[PDB]
Design a protein around this nucleic acid. Structure first.
Lengths: 121, 93, 72, 136, 195, 99, 77, 107, 132
RNA sequence: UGGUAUGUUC
RNA sequence: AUACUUACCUUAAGAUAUCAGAGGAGAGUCCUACUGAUCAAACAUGCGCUUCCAAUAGUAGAAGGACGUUAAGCAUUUAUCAUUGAACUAUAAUUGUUCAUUGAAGUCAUUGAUGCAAACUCCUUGGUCACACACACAUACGGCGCGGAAGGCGUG
RNA sequence: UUGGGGCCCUUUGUUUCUUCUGCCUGGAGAAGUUUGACACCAAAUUCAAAUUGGUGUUAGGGGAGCUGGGGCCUUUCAAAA
């Protein structure tokens, strides 16, 4: 889908990407990751869960496929019953804009620590 | 140690969430008290079996390994667990 | 690590479900950190009835959830 | 039952379910436009939602959510695709739609005020007590 | 170790009995509720406008648009727009907090008022009301209010209050109207109403 | 003896002692005498191959793999020769060593 | 009365030496009847005088060290 | 003596992976977690001759138009059944086990 | 048999993607347009599309970034093209195109007509005179 | 050598 | 905010990239602002590199949807068992046909569910950019404009 | 400084860095800017007002000086033909 996912990136670098994560059933969840852990428990913002019916599976066996989509919103999915994750869609704001946003967050956090040091005195 | 997702599951205590089990039964109700092992307890539970029918339990308690996922409300979209550069105000000795 | 919060189910009738249908209704006498459930006066419920002895202990691996049949 | 006089809770619940479930933001306008012609008791909450949702508009292209473009071109003499400085154009749109809403508000206000001040301010019991009760 | 992201308070080794007691205390409740209110207010109040795309418009559109008319722009001073936006914000929050409560006060003398509308003898959600009473472990919270409770029990029957008009009811509230459009009310009523 | 109270950083020596004188005597004999073994897996994938390495999870490196399975519809046997393989100990049902 | 943990429940079940019905996994699995003589922390239960009956003609089995990962339910027949 | 460190020395190796569902994945390795959560790029995956769940998992990953060509796939550890390495790589030099050599020298 | 197409979209950075786009916008439900990841056949001095549309030709020169050329089987396919459209703006990505008969036909047109190679030598000599 | 939460008086 | 009482708790460890050589410290271990090589991160930087970036010489269109309409569209499929009574086909726990008493749960949905197919409308995204409305190409296309988004390779 | 022409004003709180005055016969004026300031939410103190806990903002473009790096040309030293 001409996204060109990064060639040397991991889960700390794939954050806030619109993932298309596959499970053991095939119940594909599409949404933005915002956190993970050692067991790969993924929170998913604006997530949608898509499946294929049993009648559509005969047409899928060797065209249009009518998938069943349900809307989950902000969910938190476990890492046991998942199989694979890919990157489907890029986020809204770019890498330089995320860098400027992270510098603003660091400056705001340093200002908050200076405010806590001023309130402690 | 614990991690961000179990802290997020412990964050939304006392809110209407929706579980799905590994069998296919979807629960929905108010979370009583979540744990680090995700063995979560719900109240005013409405249940949908994988056969299709809908029933109502009063006080359910599901084990964490038999959970497909759980849906938190959308106002936890903006949480301080999601902040990457939040500094730490002087941890004690 | 953490003991599960089954303190509210101390003297109440519960109903365990086992793996898609085996509904064992009993009275919770005790638990562990493994969700192994001790039930007094167990009863198998099928959609018929079957009695399961005086006391029983049920492995937490096959336990999915449990309905609190009695009011709290 | 949707034409009930004291049905403010029903229509508040139905607009809440449309605003929570629907994502196209079209059925809410249709139902609220229907409510702005129904003589309800608690009616000014729906007019206040209408007036603050006119204020919550973002561009001229959402005026097709209200009516069709030919009814805007004929009755209000306003075009959706009129490109240029759209500031006072949208302000004049808000003023003319507020005038039409004010006229329909006067009509529905006279109807509800007549029904209340003549009829509905006298009936005190609206429930089934018993077969042994007495009504004044 | 445990750190509360809300209260900015640390803790000892992570005990469930201490962490459970931390989410009940009033300071964590105040900080958490204020943080959720401010984050919801920020994500409502953030006017994420679209990035504008201006193209080189057509010739005949320029000869048509620059000859029809020129509209008038209205604009206000700083204190006027500040007061108007503050009144609009208080109107939006009082519309978001309000709800129609006519069916509760309109079926007040109904024989099943103590089984549905009392909200404590309700069947499905009455145990939730009876569970968390907020048991007021402070003596000042129990000694502050000195009014009656008026707790209607479920066992109230139709024998009590047989005639609803002898026991003094309330006249129903009038249909409220918009104060900005209150000058167009019919000033002459149809019938003569006294008092 | 409890596992957590043995020692620190000397558990690898006990793991090697269990490797030399425990149930690992067959995976050790196959990697030093280069004999072919037959591993039956949890999806009928029988592997005839020589063992190259040992793991605590029974993760086994196999060289000159001749694998065979059976499709039952009707009954056919399908085989494949794979040069290098890294097999997970989850899939392993049983390991047989020929003399 | 009091709390009875599952390890002490199996320990009292061991002391009393009641007749035991041990269930297992689903339809492939076969229900066993016997008497408990030993167990451990991973619930590997040792049983004696074992007669197996399938899910709805029993055969004797002897003495069995039944592993933990297939044990589902234990009752006193 | 975990052999995941053997796969950590297998960066930029063009391998295949048969999963437990039955899918064969042809692609180059980029990185692998010590819990064997392996990421792959320049991937085509194929379900051979069936399993309808595996066909659903094959199609519902985007980029089908039954060989599915995908740019980047992370694979969880418990879904890996087996991984086939290229025969041109020398196993005698990549399995030197320098951590095991340091553990033997520390004894 | 070359046709000059003018007022075409400017910048798709790949040439074969613009070829797929143009063969999609000439006729819907084409054999090569409905199926991506298909190797485009090259025709040296094979029918690629129906209605006689043989191939296209674009360039990245700064003087004619928008407009491009197309070539057909023969003059009859071009006459059928201009008799099927007959002064009607065919739609592409956002704009209306205009077609015409070019003053110089394609080199593939010379390969078709002469085989019913000197002009390539003349163009090489003209390029040698221009690059001097 | 301490932390979290709660109730009184100034 | 100070002062005091009460309820719970008072901590799994070790380490911070790898290989080779030289020196020092009483076969094994540690250190070197010690030296060479590989790898990782950060900041710059360049590769006629790889992909994409929406008409305005019009009233359009690309990507993703509608949890939107026509649409109750068209074609199919199901909507509980047992005992007995008046006849009964009948290997069943009278299964089948018409009517009923009784017994246990008893998804809503039949305007339901699946498949098929077209049209209309509306949402989020962009460089809606700088010159020109132009005759190039077998070594198939002067990729030799200002940038932005994603990525590869190389250097400090 | 004035005048003319073209575009934009959705900047929807009419520039959104903040405050005040003020605007479509116009697009402006004054002040301040990281141990500070501005706006808002929640509360008990029974109007207003004051106190406490938090949230978000403090921006964009151009220019002089300094510095890091990339490319070309010139001068000088050391080494190899």
């Amino acid at each position: 889908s001409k996204i060109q996912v990064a060639h040397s990136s991991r889960l700390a670098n794939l954050i806030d990407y619109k993932l298309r994560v596959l499970t053991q059933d095939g119940r594909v969840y599409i949404g933005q990751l915002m956190a993970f852990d050692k067991h790969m428990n993924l929170v998913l913002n604006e997530c949608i869960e898509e499946r294929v019916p049993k009648t559509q599976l005969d047409k899928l066996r060797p065209l249009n496929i009518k998938v069943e989509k349900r809307v989950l919103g902000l969910t938190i999915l476990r890492g046991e019953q998942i199989l694979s994750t890919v990157v489907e869609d890029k986020p809204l704001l770019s890498k330089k804009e995320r860098l400027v946003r992270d510098k603003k967050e660091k400056k705001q956090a340093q200002k908050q620590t200076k405010l806590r040091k001023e309130k402690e005195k | 140690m614990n991690g961000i997702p179990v802290k997020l599951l412990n964050e939304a205590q006392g809110h209407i969430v929706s579980l799905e089990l590994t069998t296919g039964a979807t629960y929905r109700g108010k979370l009583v008290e979540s744990e680090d092992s995700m063995n979560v307890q719900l109240r005013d539970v409405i249940a949908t079996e994988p056969q299709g029918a809908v029933t109502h339990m009063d006080q359910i308690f599901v084990r964490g390994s038999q959970i497909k996922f759980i849906v938190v409300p959308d106002l936890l979209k903006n949480a301080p667990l999601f902040k990457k550069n939040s500094s730490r105000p002087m941890p004690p000795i | 690590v953490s003991t599960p919060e089954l303190k509210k189910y101390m003297d109440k009738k519960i109903l365990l479900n086992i793996n898609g249908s085996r509904k064992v209704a009993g009275i919770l006498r005790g638990y562990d950190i493994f969700l192994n459930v001790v039930l007094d006066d167990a009863m198998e419920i099928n959609g018929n009835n079957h009695q399961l002895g005086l006391q029983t202990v049920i492995r937490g691996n096959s336990i999915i959830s449990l309905e609190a049949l009695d009011a709290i | 039952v949707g034409l009930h006089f004291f049905s403010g809770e029903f229509w508040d619940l139905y607009l809440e379910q449309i605003s929570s479930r629907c994502t196209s933001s079209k059925k809410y306008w249709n139902v609220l436009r229907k409510i702005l012609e129904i003589p309800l008791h608690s009616f000014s909450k729906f007019y206040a939602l209408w007036l603050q949702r006119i204020d919550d508009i973002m561009d001229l292209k959402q005026l097709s959510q209200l009516t069709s473009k030919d009814e805007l071109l004929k009755k209000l003499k306003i075009d959706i695709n009129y490109s240029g400085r759209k500031g006072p154009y949208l302000q004049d749109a808000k003023k003319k739609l507020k005038k039409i809403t004010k006229e329909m508000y006067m009509v529905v206000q006279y109807q509800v005020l007549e029904i209340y001040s003549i009829f509905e301010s006298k009936i005190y019991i609206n429930y089934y007590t018993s077969p042994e009760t007495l009504v004044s | 170790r445990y750190y509360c992201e809300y209260c900015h308070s640390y803790l000892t080794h992570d005990t469930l009995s201490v962490r459970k007691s931390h989410l009940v205390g009033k300071n964590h409740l105040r900080i958490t509720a204020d943080y959720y209110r401010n984050k919801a207010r920020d994500i409502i109040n953030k006017h994420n406008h679209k990035r504008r795309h201006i193209g080189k418009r057509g010739r005949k559109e320029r000869e048509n648009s620059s000859q029809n008319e020129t509209l008038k722009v209205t604009c206000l001073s700083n204190k006027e727009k500040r007061h108007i936006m503050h009144v609009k914000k208080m109107n939006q929050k009082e519309l978001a907090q309000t709800s129609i409560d006519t069916l509760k006060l309109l079926y007040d003398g109904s024989p099943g008022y103590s089984k549905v509308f009392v909200d404590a003898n309700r069947f499905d959600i009455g145990d939730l009301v009876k569970a968390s009473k907020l048991p007021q472990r402070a003596n000042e919270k129990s000694a502050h209010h000195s009014f009656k409770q008026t707790s209607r029990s479920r066992d109230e029957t139709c024998e009590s209050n047989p005639f609803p008009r002898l026991n003094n009811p309330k006249k129903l509230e009038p249909p409220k109207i918009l104060s900005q459009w209150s000058n167009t009310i019919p000033k002459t009523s149809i019938f003569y109403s006294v008092d | 003896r409890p596992k957590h109270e043995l020692s620190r950083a000397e558990l690898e020596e006990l793991e090697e002692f269990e490797f030399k004188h425990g149930p690992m005597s067959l995976i050790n004999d196959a990697m030093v005498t280069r004999t072919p073994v037959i591993i039956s897996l949890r999806n009928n994938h029988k592997i005839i191959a020589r063992v190259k390495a040992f793991d605590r999870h029974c993760n086994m490196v196999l060289e000159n793999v001749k694998e065979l399975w059976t499709e039952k519809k009707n009954v056919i046997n399908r085989e494949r020769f794979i040069s290098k393989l890294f097999l997970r100990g989850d899939s392993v049902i049983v390991v047989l060593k020929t003399p | 009365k009091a709390m009875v943990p599952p390890i002490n429940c199996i320990f009292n079940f061991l002391q009393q030496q009641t007749p035991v019905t041990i269930w297992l996994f689903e339809q492939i699995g076969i229900r066993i009847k016997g008497k408990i003589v030993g167990f451990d922390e991973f619930m590997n239960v040792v049983i004696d005088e074992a007669v197996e009956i399938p899910v709805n003609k029993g055969t004797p089995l002897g003495k069995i060290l039944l592993k933990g990962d297939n044990i589902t339910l234990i009752t006193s027949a | 003596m975990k052999l995941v460190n053997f796969l950590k020395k297998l960066r930029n190796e063009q391998v295949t992976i048969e999963l437990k569902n039955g899918t064969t994945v042809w692609g180059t390795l980029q990185s692998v977690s010590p819990q064997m959560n392996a990421i792959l790029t320049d991937v085509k995956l194929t379900l051979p001759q069936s399993n309808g769940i595996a066909m659903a998992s094959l199609y519902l990953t985007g980029g089908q138009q039954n060989i599915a060509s995908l740019q980047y796939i992370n694979i969880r550890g418990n879904t890996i059944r087996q991984i086939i390495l290229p025969d041109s790589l020398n196993l005698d030099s990549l399995l030197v086990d320098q951590k095991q050599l340091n553990s033997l020298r520390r004894s | 048999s070359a046709l000059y197409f003018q007022n075409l979209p400017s910048r798709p950075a790949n040439k074969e993607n613009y070829t797929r786009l143009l063969l999609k916008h000439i006729n819907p439900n084409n054999k090569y347009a409905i199926n991506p990841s298909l190797p485009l056949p090259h025709n040296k001095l094979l029918l690629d599309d129906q209605m006689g549309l043989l191939e296209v030709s674009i360039s990245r020169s700064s003087k004619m970034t928008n407009q491009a050329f197309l070539t057909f089987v023969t003059q009859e396919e071009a006459d059928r093209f201009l008799e099927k459209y007959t002064t009607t703006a065919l739609k592409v990505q956002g704009r209306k195109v205009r077609m015409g008969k070019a003053r110089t036909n394609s080199l593939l047109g010379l390969s078709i007509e002469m085989q019913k190679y000197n002009l390539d030598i003349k163009k090489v000599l003209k390029a040698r005179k221009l690059k001097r």
